Scaffold this active site. Structure first.
Site, PDB file in Angstrom:
ATOM      1  N   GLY A 274       2.796   5.710   9.162  1.00 46.76           N
ATOM      2  CA  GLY A 274       4.130   5.992   8.662  1.00 46.76           C
ATOM      3  C   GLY A 274       5.063   4.819   8.901  1.00 46.76           C
ATOM      4  O   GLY A 274       6.078   4.678   8.218  1.00 46.76           O
TER       5      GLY A 274
ATOM      6  N   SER B  66       1.867  -3.618   8.069  1.00 49.44           N
ATOM      7  CA  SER B  66       0.730  -3.401   7.176  1.00 49.44           C
ATOM      8  C   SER B  66      -0.262  -2.369   7.715  1.00 49.44           C
ATOM      9  O   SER B  66      -0.644  -1.447   6.999  1.00 49.44           O
ATOM     10  CB  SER B  66      -0.010  -4.715   6.900  1.00 49.44           C
TER      11      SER B  66
ATOM     12  N   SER C  77       4.291   1.901   8.299  1.00 49.85           N
ATOM     13  CA  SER C  77       3.988   0.954   7.228  1.00 49.85           C
ATOM     14  C   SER C  77       5.205   0.605   6.381  1.00 49.85           C
ATOM     15  O   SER C  77       5.988   1.479   6.007  1.00 49.85           O
ATOM     16  CB  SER C  77       2.879   1.508   6.331  1.00 49.85           C
TER      17      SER C  77
ATOM     18  N   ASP D  16      -0.497  -7.419   1.155  1.00 48.35           N
ATOM     19  CA  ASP D  16       0.026  -6.068   1.344  1.00 48.35           C
ATOM     20  C   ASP D  16       1.542  -6.185   1.299  1.00 48.35           C
ATOM     21  O   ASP D  16       2.218  -6.133   2.326  1.00 48.35           O
ATOM     22  CB  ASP D  16      -0.426  -5.454   2.674  1.00 48.35           C
TER      23      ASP D  16
ATOM     24  N   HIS E 245       0.803  -1.218   0.000  1.00 43.00           N
ATOM     25  CA  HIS E 245       0.000   0.000   0.000  1.00 43.00           C
ATOM     26  C   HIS E 245       0.841   1.276   0.000  1.00 43.00           C
ATOM     27  O   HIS E 245       0.300   2.377  -0.112  1.00 43.00           O
ATOM     28  CB  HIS E 245      -1.012  -0.009   1.165  1.00 43.00           C
TER      29      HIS E 245
END
Length: 198
Positions: free
Chosen positions: A141, A159, A143, A63, A36
């Protein structure tokens, strides 16, 4: 740039995510991260300089993604822990109940335990299945960032999570936290990647 898990990088001069792990695909250098975080061909930058582009990704459903880097980048078998480092020694998957930590540009180095597996997240873009859950806190952030055990076994990439109004779930008890990561093993085999270890 030196590729270390947990550090910040930008996508198309817009979104900011965290590096997962340094990997190789034959002679090609790269790093795994969350799907993502960017679309195929999106440009990744670190320290204001272009370091590579998104080679492939799957999101939603899964993801995951990997960024193909220029030969000038320096791959390192490490994850950031404050000013220090955690050495990436392998990718043995830990079981439910095991302690685990993650590194991200927003909450730094956070630890907790693995509370469940095969969890489905219902994101705005669609569902993402097969995620592993932990009670370590995280924030927007983080992620794409590294999830790793203290012994250096890489677990996956950040994720999502049940962040609160302050952008993270560090302000609520561990018992109420749901921080989810995408397992590393399927990312490595999906793209034929080998983890850089030390």
């Amino acid at each position: 740039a030196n590729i270390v898990g947990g550090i910040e990088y930008s996508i198309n001069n817009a979104s900011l995510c965290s590096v997962g792990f340094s990997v190789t695909r034959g002679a090609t250098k790269g790093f795994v991260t969350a799907g993502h975080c960017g679309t195929v061909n999106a440009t990744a930058r670190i320290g204001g300089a272009v370091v590579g582009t998104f080679a492939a990704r799957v999101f939603p459903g899964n993801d995951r993604a990997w960024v193909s880097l220029t030969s000038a980048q320096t791959l390192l078998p490490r994850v950031a822990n404050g000013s220090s480092f955690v050495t990436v020694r392998g990718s043995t998957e830990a079981a439910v109940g095991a302690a685990v930590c993650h590194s991200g540009r927003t909450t730094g180095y956070q630890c907790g335990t693995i509370t469940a597996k095969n969890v489905t997240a219902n994101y705005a873009e669609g569902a993402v299945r097969g995620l592993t859950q932990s009670n370590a806190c995280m924030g927007r952030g983080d992620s794409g960032g590294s999830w790793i055990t203290s012994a250096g076994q890489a677990q996956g990439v950040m994720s999502g999570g049940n962040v609160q109004s302050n952008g993270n779930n560090c302000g609520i008890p561990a018992s109420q936290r749901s921080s989810l990561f995408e397992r590393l093993q399927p990312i490595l085999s999906q793209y034929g990647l080998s983890l850089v270890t030390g």
